[PDB]
Amino acid sequence: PQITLWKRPLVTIRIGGQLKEALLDTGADDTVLEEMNLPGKWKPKMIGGIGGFIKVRQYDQIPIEICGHKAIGTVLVGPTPVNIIGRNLLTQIGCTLNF
Amino acid sequence: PQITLWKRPLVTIRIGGQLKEALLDTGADDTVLEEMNLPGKWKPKMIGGIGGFIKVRQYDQIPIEICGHKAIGTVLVGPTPVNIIGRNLLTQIGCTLNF
Ligand SMILES: COc1ccc(S(=O)(=O)N(CC(C)C)C[C@@H](O)[C@H](Cc2ccccc2)NC(=O)[C@@H]2CN(c3cccc(C(F)(F)F)c3)C(=O)O2)cc1
Structure with a gap:
């Protein structure tokens, strides 16, 4: 689709059979999701943002369907x-x- | 033009006598610029992102040229x-x- 920017570009994603809303964020290098359980091994990582740095868990090779696109x-x-x-x-x- | 997202979507902007590089950021409600001493009235504000909040000065009706678009x-x-x-x-x- 074509998405205009008068509203936040929020879309439904499907991850681990769960539906969540996520923001399409061209100013973000990396995909970052709020606290949730995902299966498999993860690695501790730290990332920066406008307000400082946070700790995150890095999960590799996770399928997400984003607005119908794999x-x-x-x-x-x-x-x-x-x-x-x-x-x-x-x-x-x-x-x-x-x- | 069309901008792919293999790299950060940086473009040249102009605000007065200052040329700067800036992210075209669909995940940002508002435009946020690095510290600069603009003329005119402003109001204090807090904005939040990854890592927490920062204090900013809100200036209204500021002309800015973005990739030669007004x-x-x-x-x-x-x-x-x-x-x-x-x-x-x-x-x-x-x-x-x-x-
Ligand atoms: C009301 O208006 C607003 C409110 C919040 C923002 S936001 O910048 O925090 N952010 C909001 C979003 C998290 C929901 C927009 C993101 O696109 C944001 C832009 C940004 C890029 C780089 C530094 C700071 C902000 N992006 C990110 O938070 C992450 C942070 N980030 C990054 C990468 C490497 C290094 C660094 C750092 F500078 F922190 F070292 C940050 C990156 O690629 O994307 C902007 C405008």
């Missing part, structure tokens, strides 16, 4: 203020900016 | 590591997300 990649889980889909998965679903 | 609107000035062009101005230059 991705498989890295998902960071931690105290993000909102679920964000970053460029690592935006590229997988073929998302571009146009003006 | 915009004018609210700009938040504060201790951000990166200049962020948020949705309030992305809409003014005709910016959409497409996939």
